[PDB]
UniProtKB/Swiss-Prot annotation, chain A:
Present with 450 molecules/cell in log phase SD medium. PROSITE patterns: RIBOSOMAL_L3. Belongs to the universal ribosomal protein uL3 family. The modification Phosphothreonine is found at residue 102. The keyword Translocase does not apply. PANTHER family: 60S RIBOSOMAL PROTEIN L3-RELATED (PTHR11363), LARGE RIBOSOMAL SUBUNIT PROTEIN UL3 (PTHR11363:SF5). Component of the ribosome, a large ribonucleoprotein complex responsible for the synthesis of proteins in the cell. The small ribosomal subunit (SSU) binds messenger RNAs (mRNAs) and translates the encoded message by selecting cognate aminoacyl-transfer RNA (tRNA) molecules. The large subunit (LSU) contains the ribosomal catalytic site termed the peptidyl transferase center (PTC), which catalyzes the formation of peptide bonds, thereby polymerizing the amino acids delivered by tRNAs into a polypeptide chain. It comes from the Eukaryota. Methylation at His-242 by HPM1 is required for proper 60S subunit assembly and promotes translational elongation fidelity. The lineage of its organism: Eukaryota, Fungi, Dikarya, Ascomycota, Saccharomycotina. It comes from Saccharomyces cerevisiae (strain ATCC 204508 / S288c). InterPro entries: L3_arc_euk, Ribosomal_L3_dom_3_arc_sf, Ribosomal_uL3, Ribosomal_uL3_CS, Transl_B-barrel_sf. This is Large ribosomal subunit protein uL3.
UniProtKB/Swiss-Prot annotation, chain B:
This is Large ribosomal subunit protein eL19A. Component of the large ribosomal subunit (LSU). Mature yeast ribosomes consist of a small (40S) and a large (60S) subunit. The 40S small subunit contains 1 molecule of ribosomal RNA (18S rRNA) and 33 different proteins (encoded by 57 genes). The large 60S subunit contains 3 rRNA molecules (25S, 5.8S and 5S rRNA) and 46 different proteins (encoded by 81 genes). eL19 lies in close proximity to the binding site for eukaryotic initiation factor eIF4G. It is found in: Cytoplasm. There is a cross-link at residues 20, 52, 59 (Glycyl lysine isopeptide (Lys-Gly) (interchain with G-Cter in ubiquitin)). Coiled coil: none annotated. The chain holds residues 2 to 64 of 189 of the full protein. Belongs to the eukaryotic ribosomal protein eL19 family. Component of the ribosome, a large ribonucleoprotein complex responsible for the synthesis of proteins in the cell. The small ribosomal subunit (SSU) binds messenger RNAs (mRNAs) and translates the encoded message by selecting cognate aminoacyl-transfer RNA (tRNA) molecules. The large subunit (LSU) contains the ribosomal catalytic site termed the peptidyl transferase center (PTC), which catalyzes the formation of peptide bonds, thereby polymerizing the amino acids delivered by tRNAs into a polypeptide chain. Residues 58-63 have a biased composition (Basic residues). Present with 97700 molecules/cell in log phase SD medium. There are 2 genes for eL19 in yeast. The modification Phosphoserine is found at residues 29, 36. It comes from the Eukaryota.
Curated annotation (Swiss-Prot), chain C:
GO terms for molecular function: structural constituent of ribosome. PANTHER family: 60S RIBOSOMAL PROTEIN L31. This is Large ribosomal subunit protein eL31A. It is found in: Cytoplasm. It comes from the Eukaryota. Component of the large ribosomal subunit (LSU). Mature yeast ribosomes consist of a small (40S) and a large (60S) subunit. The 40S small subunit contains 1 molecule of ribosomal RNA (18S rRNA) and 33 different proteins (encoded by 57 genes). The large 60S subunit contains 3 rRNA molecules (25S, 5.8S and 5S rRNA) and 46 different proteins (encoded by 81 genes). Keywords: Cytoplasm, Ribonucleoprotein, Ribosomal protein. InterPro entries: Ribosomal_eL31 (IPR000054), Ribosomal_eL31_CS (IPR020052), Ribosomal_eL31_dom_sf (IPR023621). GO terms for cellular component: cytosol; cytosolic large ribosomal subunit. GO terms for biological process: cytoplasmic translation; regulation of translational fidelity. Component of the ribosome, a large ribonucleoprotein complex responsible for the synthesis of proteins in the cell. The small ribosomal subunit (SSU) binds messenger RNAs (mRNAs) and translates the encoded message by selecting cognate aminoacyl-transfer RNA (tRNA) molecules. The large subunit (LSU) contains the ribosomal catalytic site termed the peptidyl transferase center (PTC), which catalyzes the formation of peptide bonds, thereby polymerizing the amino acids delivered by tRNAs into a polypeptide chain. Its main location: cytoplasm.
Curated annotation (Swiss-Prot), chain D:
GO terms for biological process: cleavage in ITS2 between 5.8S rRNA and LSU-rRNA of tricistronic rRNA transcript (SSU-rRNA, 5.8S rRNA, LSU-rRNA); cytoplasmic translation. PROSITE patterns: RIBOSOMAL_L22. There are 2 genes for uL22 in yeast. Pfam families: Ribosomal_L22. GO terms for cellular component: cytoplasm; cytosol; cytosolic large ribosomal subunit; preribosome, large subunit precursor. This is Large ribosomal subunit protein uL22A. The keyword Ribosomal protein applies.
Length: 386, 63, 109, 183
RNA sequence: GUGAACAGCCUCUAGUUGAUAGAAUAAUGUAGAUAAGGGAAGUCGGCAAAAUAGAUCCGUAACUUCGGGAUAAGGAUUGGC
RNA sequence: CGUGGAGGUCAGUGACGAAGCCUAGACCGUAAGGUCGGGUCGAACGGCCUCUAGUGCAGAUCUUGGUGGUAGUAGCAAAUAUUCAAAUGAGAACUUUGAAGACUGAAGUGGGGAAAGGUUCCACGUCAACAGCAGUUGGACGUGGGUUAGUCGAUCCUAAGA
RNA sequence: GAAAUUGUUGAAAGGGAAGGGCAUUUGAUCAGACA
């Protein structure tokens, strides 16, 4: 008949279907445009989401009421031990799209990745790559022509890297394997780089720097079967209504005589792939560095790990990326940090932050103390102690 | 084995509700044979069925 | 083979009963323990001593103590041959408090 | 006797029956079929597992709005169940077959279940009282169960016909030649 | 026993412990609760819900058939020893 | 063309298998139908000329009986609540006994009665059906036992009324 | 001891119904007529 009152539809049709992702590891749908003038490097990085804390910093924003004043800001921390490079994979252009034509693998493969190739490690004979590993033997001949062929053809080159999950409090023990586009120099220079980095190791500082704008690709936390009200942000129907009220009252007109794809319906909520962009790196931490959590202004020797340790995660004993704000996914989930697809100028992007203080009190409650030392100071001797 | 009849009989001979007759689980054969009031009477006499004490309701706080 | 052992454990009933409905807590305890014995003695057959029952229901359905010190005994089975030759008896150990004890073996003779 | 269609060698088979059994016809139909053709010994151990909930019975006909279980993967199926009363009636008749088989003097190691057939015994009426004064039939669906165990036997040899060939004057002349020509 | 009390709530005597069961805790329900700031803007309509309440003391308007209206309204107090 | 029954006839068919029923076997007929084979079966039946009618079904929200899909689906969610062990038994979540945890809370889930029921009481045996899971239990099934009055009622008296 | 309806066995077909008409291929099956 015509609405009555106009109101915007509930929820975005660009995030359909609202099904469960095909995997925990969200896919990198797109890599940055290649500029073959610059050196070879990764264009993304694997990590694990540890947790969140607070930051204090002066603000550099002429014109703003808060120029030259402190602000407090939430941040996420993702555990980021060096990634290890075990393969190169070379794609060619076709009128049917990009197709892979070979993969060359490292001679030796950490049990971690090998574990990924299996569904029952303990029972297995662990025979993975054992014949491939041979290929190196004979002078190299066969591996060479594979590198060679990548170079001859291939419009793009990706590396095969994986995570050193053992350097991580997780139980999960089976590592994460993934393709990172290489975006440095010429095709040949690319594969050379890869070949050189077989069984060799790469760290975030070689791909991210302070104040850089990055994106995060991950699978969203899960919530199971969700009624229409919370899943689409539909009105609660009045208290008086029979047969329940977290619903849509009208599921469609009488014609088209079909429920339509565009109305809200109960169903899976969360465990979705998201590619969420513009997260500024506020810190790139080093694992072999006490005073991880310390600052030019703070100076106390302490690492980022909160008292009692990251709730539901653990300790952070590796390099981390600290990113302003929050990020898709949850504590313990694999997560891809990615180089941005454009060169932002934003002013907001470009600001060169410099932390003043990183919160480090217990997240497991109303944390009153940064360190056990501070806690001793304030409290005095207890019936335990010396 | 089914001693409800004896337990009922027990309650009446003794003068007390069934909630307080004790049928000795180890004398379960001997008890079953007791079909009469006279038989239960003997079984009470020698400890095979005992009266079981009243649950106390103390007036000490009321005092 | 077999083995025949007696050890004394303490079981955290608290985290196992956490969440459970009040009219199900003492009953859950019974089950939860049974499952605890089987995880340790490997034995399907698990019998609970009538005294252990009392220990458990000692404060009514929803008042189960957070920690019970038990003694589990893996024993051989007799008569009409059950599925498995082995079984566990569980019993309460009379202890001032069940707080603070690691698990011990009972040298049996 | 007079069982259903069988193709088997009666001299090397034993049989068993139950009639009018208060088990669900639909359920024990499904559980009889998970056994059909099985090696007797593998089948008996199988039912035993079903009861332990370690393998399931695949429901393939009477199964709409059944649950789902990983225990049906082994049979390429998503819906499967663990019909206790059905299992225990069927494994009851199975035991009987074995006994009869032992009596006939048949190698108990070659025994497979070659026939297994449930169908429908007469129904049995109780009634339920419905709202507003009404009555509904509340009914048992009992079953007849029948099975036959036969001893596996190898081979089959050959032999059949000889196909009598019929060639025209031009067909047997080319043949007459072909060889007069070459080999 | 508490209490004004044959109320509610706990108990002795007596009697029951019968009501398919197990495992989980998605949506939506039924039944039971709570919510910052605002406070009827919701709705035909305060529907539903919330608020009030016992006892002692103080204080109590219009109007009236002088009997009421009246626990009007409005306040303070209340344990243990 | 086809059915039930009747007069006539073929000295018709048949326990060496009548009738009926089954049969993606055969044959005649444009068709209603007719014929045969094989299997099943068990006592009667058919061609031809006539006579006769309670004579031919897809329907009537047709009548009676039977049967499906729905479907192993809706469901078996009110009355706070159950637990350990033993015994018995082919079999025990549910029977008996012991222990424990509770409940009804004397306006009772206690102890008796009036109307009504009619053996349900009680013992022994006992599970095919019944108790919308179960069952060794039962108000079930089988076989028995059991109700004692000068004083308790009736009986007597009168009431509305008959 | 029909039918509806059901179990098994054997054979066959099945990309949002199935069944039907004229026609032929293929498979299975079968009558007759020949001397
Ligand atoms: Mg408009
Ligand atoms: Mg999938
Ligand atoms: Mg190749
Ligand atoms: Mg919700
Ligand atoms: Mg909203
Ligand atoms: Mg939201
Ligand atoms: Mg709505
Ligand atoms: Mg309404
Ligand atoms: Mg916290
Ligand atoms: Mg909870
Ligand atoms: Mg039969
Ligand atoms: Mg069907
Ligand atoms: Mg069906
Ligand atoms: Mg279902
Ligand atoms: Mg359903
Ligand atoms: Mg469906
Ligand atoms: Mg399926
Ligand atoms: Mg009903
Ligand atoms: Mg009625
Ligand atoms: Mg030739
Ligand atoms: Mg009573
Ligand atoms: Mg009920
Ligand atoms: Mg339930
Ligand atoms: Mg509020
Ligand atoms: Mg206000
Ligand atoms: Mg208004
Ligand atoms: Mg107002
Ligand atoms: Mg309005
Ligand atoms: Mg109005
Ligand atoms: Mg209005
Ligand atoms: Mg109201
Ligand atoms: Mg309030
Ligand atoms: Mg007034
Ligand atoms: Mg005072
Ligand atoms: Mg005629
Ligand atoms: Mg006629
Ligand atoms: Mg007639
Ligand atoms: Mg036919
Ligand atoms: Mg013919
Ligand atoms: Mg014949
Ligand atoms: Mg005949
Ligand atoms: Mg005869
Ligand atoms: Mg005529
Ligand atoms: Mg007529
Ligand atoms: Mg017609
Ligand atoms: Mg008809
Ligand atoms: Mg019709
Ligand atoms: Mg018609
Ligand atoms: Mg009809
Ligand atoms: Mg009908
Ligand atoms: Mg069923
Ligand atoms: Mg159901
Ligand atoms: Mg209901
Ligand atoms: Mg029960
Ligand atoms: Mg109590
Ligand atoms: Mg009470
Ligand atoms: Mg009361
Ligand atoms: Mg009752
Ligand atoms: Mg009486
Ligand atoms: Mg009666
Ligand atoms: Mg009785
Ligand atoms: Mg029975
Ligand atoms: Mg009955
Ligand atoms: Mg029943
Ligand atoms: Mg039964
Ligand atoms: Mg009787
Ligand atoms: Mg009698
Ligand atoms: Mg008198
Ligand atoms: Mg008299
Ligand atoms: Mg017959
Ligand atoms: Mg065919
Ligand atoms: Mg044709």
């Amino acid at each position: 008949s015509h609405r009555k009152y106009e109101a915007p539809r509930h929820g975005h049709l660009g995030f359909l279907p609202r099904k469960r992702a095909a995997s925990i590891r969200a896919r990198v749908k797109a890599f940055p445009k290649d500029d073959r003038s610059k050196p070879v490097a990764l264009t993304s990085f694997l990590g694990y989401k540890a947790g969140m804390t607070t930051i204090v910093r002066d603000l550099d924003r002429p014109g703003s009421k808060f120029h030259k004043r402190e602000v407090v800001e939430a941040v996420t921390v993702v555990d980021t031990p060096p990634v290890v490079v075990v393969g190169v994979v070379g794609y060619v252009e076709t009128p049917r799209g990009l197709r892979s034509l070979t993969t060359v693998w490292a001679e030796h493969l950490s049990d971690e990745v090998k574990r990924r190739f299996y569904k029952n490690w303990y029972k297995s004979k662990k025979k993975a790559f054992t014949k491939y590993s041979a290929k190196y033997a004979q002078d190299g001949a066969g591996i060479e022509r594979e590198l060679a062929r990548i170079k001859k053809y291939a419009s793009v080159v990706r590396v095969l890297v994986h995570t050193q999950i053992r350097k991580t409090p997780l139980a999960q023990k089976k590592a994460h394997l993934a393709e990172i586009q290489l975006n440095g120099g010429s095709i040949s220079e690319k594969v050379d780089w890869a070949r050189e980095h077989f069984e060799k190791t790469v760290a975030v500082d070689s791909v991210f720097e302070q104040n850089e704008m990055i994106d995060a690709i991950a699978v969203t936390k899960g919530h199971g079967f969700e009624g229409v009200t919370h899943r689409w942000g539909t009105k609660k129907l009045p208290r008086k209504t029979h047969r329940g009220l977290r619903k849509v009252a009208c599921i469609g007109a009488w014609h088209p005589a079909h429920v339509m794809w565009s109305v809200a319906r109960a169903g899976q909520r969360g465990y979705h792939s998201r590619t969420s962009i513009n997260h500024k790196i506020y810190r790139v931490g080093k694992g072999d560095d006490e005073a991880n959590g310390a600052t030019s202004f703070d100076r106390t020797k302490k690492t980022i790990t909160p008292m009692g340790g990251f709730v539901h995660y653990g300790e952070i004993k590796n390099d981390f990326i600290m990113v302003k704000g929050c990020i898709p996914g949850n504590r313990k989930r694999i997560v891809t940090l990615r180089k941005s697809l454009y060169t932002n100028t934003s002013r907001k992007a470009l600001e060169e932050v410099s932390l003043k203080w990183i919160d480090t009190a217990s997240k497991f409650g109303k944390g009153r103390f940064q360190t056990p030392a501070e806690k001793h100071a304030f409290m005095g001797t207890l019936k335990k102690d010396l | 084995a089914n001693l409800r009849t004896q337990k009922r009989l027990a309650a009446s001979v003794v003068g007390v509700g069934k909630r307080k007759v004790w049928l000795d689980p180890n004398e379960t054969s001997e008890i079953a044979q007791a079909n009469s009031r006279n038989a239960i009477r003997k079984l009470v006499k020698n400890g095979t069925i005992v009266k079981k004490a009243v649950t106390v309701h103390s007036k000490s706080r009321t005092r | 083979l077999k083995d025949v052992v007696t050890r004394e454990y303490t079981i955290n009933l608290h985290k196992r009963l956490h969440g459970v409905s009040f009219k199900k807590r003492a009953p859950r305890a019974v089950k939860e323990i049974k499952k605890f014995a089987k995880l340790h003695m490997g034995t399907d057959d698990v019998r609970l001593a009538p005294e252990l029952n009392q220990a458990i229901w000692k404060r009514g359905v929803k008042g189960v103590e957070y920690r019970l010190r038990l003694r589990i005994s893996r024993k051989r089975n007799e008569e009409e041959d059950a599925k498995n030759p082995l079984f566990s008896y569980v019993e309460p150990v009379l202890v001032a408090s069940a707080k603070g004890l690691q698990t011990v073996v009972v040298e049996e003779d | 006797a007079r069982y259903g269609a069988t193709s088997t060698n009666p001299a090397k088979s034993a049989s068993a029956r139950g009639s009018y059994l208060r088990v669900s016809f639909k359920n024990t139909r499904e559980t009889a079929q998970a056994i059909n053709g099985w090696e007797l010994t593998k089948a008996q151990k199988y039912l035993e597992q079903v009861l332990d909930h370690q393998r399931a019975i695949p429901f393939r006909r009477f199964n709409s709005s059944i649950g789902r279980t990983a225990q049906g993967k082994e049979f390429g199926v998503t819906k499967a169940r663990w019909p206790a009363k059905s299992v225990k009636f069927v494994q009851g008749l199975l035991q009987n077959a074995a006994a009869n088989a032992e009596a006939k003097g048949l190698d108990a190691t070659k025994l497979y279940v070659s026939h297994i057939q449930v169908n429908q015994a007469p129904k049995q009426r109780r009634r339920t009282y419905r709202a507003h004064g009404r009555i509904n039939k509340y009914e048992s669906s009992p079953s007849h169960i029948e099975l036959v165990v036969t001893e596996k036997e190898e081979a089959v040899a050959k032999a059949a016909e000889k196909k009598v060939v019929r060639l025209t004057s031009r067909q047997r002349g080319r043949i007459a030649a072909q060889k007069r020509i070459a080999a």
